[PDB]
Design a protein around this ligand. Structure first.
Ligand SMILES: [Zn+2]
Lengths: 43, 76
């Protein structure tokens, strides 16, 4: 079955199957813009 | 508090949950209403996902809010 759904993060036309991967990327950007923090200096 | 959830398909479901209730708890509530496994359901608010180990109050969610529901078939 072929279907499409908009992204609630960025609003982009993407299939319901490729949306899962897209969410993984779309969300990654959100973590990029935000400041980076590390509990331990080593890691 | 009474909140609303809107799926990508356009369907609308009104769900009653408390701020003290965890996200993982919310999914189970949905299971009964939508009949869909909690694992196969992911919620997004303001563009970011909701951590199962977090609570609604922790996300600054007030009374009557619209959440986004997405379905994750399989990761292959
Ligand atoms: Zn997106």
């Amino acid at each position: 079955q072929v279907t499409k759904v908009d992204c609630p993060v960025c609003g982009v036309n993407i299939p319901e199957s490729h949306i899962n991967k897209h969410l993984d990327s779309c969300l990654s950007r959100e973590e990029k813009k935000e400041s980076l923090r590390s509990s331990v200096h080593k890691r | 508090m009474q909140i609303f959830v809107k799926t990508l398909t356009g369907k609308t479901i009104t769900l009653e949950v408390e701020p003290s209730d965890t996200i993982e708890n919310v999914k189970a509530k949905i299971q009964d209403k939508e009949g869909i496994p909690p694992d196969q359901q992911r919620l997004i608010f303001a563009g970011k996902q909701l951590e199962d180990g977090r609570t609604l109050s922790d996300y600054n969610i007030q009374k009557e809010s619209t959440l986004h529901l997405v379905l994750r078939l399989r990761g292959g």
